[PDB]
From Swiss-Prot:
Subunit structure: Interacts with PIP.
Known tissue expression: Blood plasma, seminal plasma, urine, saliva, sweat, epithelial cells of various human glands, liver.
InterPro entries linked to this entry: Ig-like_dom, Ig-like_dom_sf, Ig-like_fold, Ig/MHC_CS, Ig_C1-set, MHC_class-I_related, MHC_I-like_Ag-recog, MHC_I-like_Ag-recog_sf
Gene: AZGP1
Record SMART domains: IGc1
An example molecular function term from Gene Ontology annotations: RNA nuclease activity
Keyword terms: Disulfide bond, Glycoprotein, Pyrrolidone carboxylic acid, Secreted, Signal
The name this protein goes by in its record: Zinc-alpha-2-glycoprotein
Length: 273
């Protein structure tokens, strides 16, 4: 088994502008986003390859949970703004929470909030208790620990519930997170009126993202003139390209080299002028 992480991020705005939802939420499994929810549509929706997955989660019921989460999250923001007596201002509250496993063993967990970009409050499950960083967080802490069970629930979420949700999602995400999709490659050239010829090597449709893409000139690795990559979440695939400029009088042989974890051995794709 390897490393898997479940991460949630909540964003609330005290005074949202037109077309921007007051509350937004998203969730990721490793490097991919699997769902989103906002206060406009009010519905938890799977994303990317999880749109094709059935039975992993009941989105209609998750929509109800997120609405409940939303209500408490925004009330927290509302209380902070009230404490500073600045409702006329535009403020933001962001919350991050989740856990991770490695070798089927819980290896991490976190739960922290940020107010206007500054650390606000975080849960330390070893105590177990919330740790305030902002003066208003002292009030929030008081409310979140009003009854003995509250901290017990928080500790249980990070230590029992979250990792159980991750293990469950992992059972339906094998063909997504554990894929070893080999890259397709395409070498292309372009001549700019007045500029040198440029050779572009593109590796696409691969996963995981880690990859080695480079050009060679007469068996000599070259220094790229332009480089880049991207991850398409809808697809769960990456693309990575490298570009080199070639002297107008150069005749040497140019070939692209691609090495990836999914390949038995590296691939070579010479360019035929
Ligand atoms: C996964 O999604 C990406 C992004 O939509 C696809 O890339 C596009 O593919 C079409 C058709 O091949 C091209 O016309 C576009 O130019 C590509 N988008 C760009 C600019 O990267 C990709 O083909 C998809 N791969 C799979 C396996 O479905
Ligand atoms: C860990 O993986 C084993 C099988 O490899 C599985 O039976 C178990 O439910 C998983 N998590 C734990 C420790 O319960």
């Amino acid at each position: 088994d390897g490393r898997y992480s479940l991460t949630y991020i909540y964003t609330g705005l005290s005074k949202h502008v037109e077309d921007v939802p007051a509350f937004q939420a998203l969730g990721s499994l490793n490097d991919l986003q699997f769902f989103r929810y906002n206060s406009k549509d009010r519905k938890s929706q799977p994303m990317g390859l999880w749109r094709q997955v059935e039975g992993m989660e009941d989105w209609k019921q998750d929509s109800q949970l997120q609405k409940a989460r939303e209500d408490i999250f925004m009330e927290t923001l509302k209380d902070i703004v009230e404490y500073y007596k600045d409702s006329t201002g535009s403020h933001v509250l962001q919350g991050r929470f989740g856990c991770e496993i490695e070798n089927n063993r819980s290896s991490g967990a976190f739960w922290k909030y940020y107010y206007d970009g500054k650390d606000y409050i975080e849960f330390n499950k070893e105590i177990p208790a919330w740790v305030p960083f902002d003066p208003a967080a002292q009030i929030t802490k008081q409310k979140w620990e009003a009854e003995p069970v509250y901290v017990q629930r928080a500790k249980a979420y990070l230590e029992e519930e979250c990792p159980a949700t991750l293990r469950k999602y992992l059972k339906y995400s094998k063909n997504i997170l554990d894929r070893q999709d080999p890259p397709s490659v395409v070498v292309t050239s372009h001549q700019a009126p007045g500029e040198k010829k440029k050779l572009k090597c593109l590796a696409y449709d691969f996963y995981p993202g880690k990859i080695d893409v480079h050009w060679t000139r007469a068996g000599e690795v070259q220094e790229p003139e332009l480089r880049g990559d991207v991850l398409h979440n809808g697809n769960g695939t990456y693309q990575s390209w490298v570009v080199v400029a070639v002297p107008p009088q150069d005749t040497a042989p140019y070939s692209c080299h691609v090495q990836h974890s999914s390949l038995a051995q590296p691939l070579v794709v010479p360019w035929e002028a």
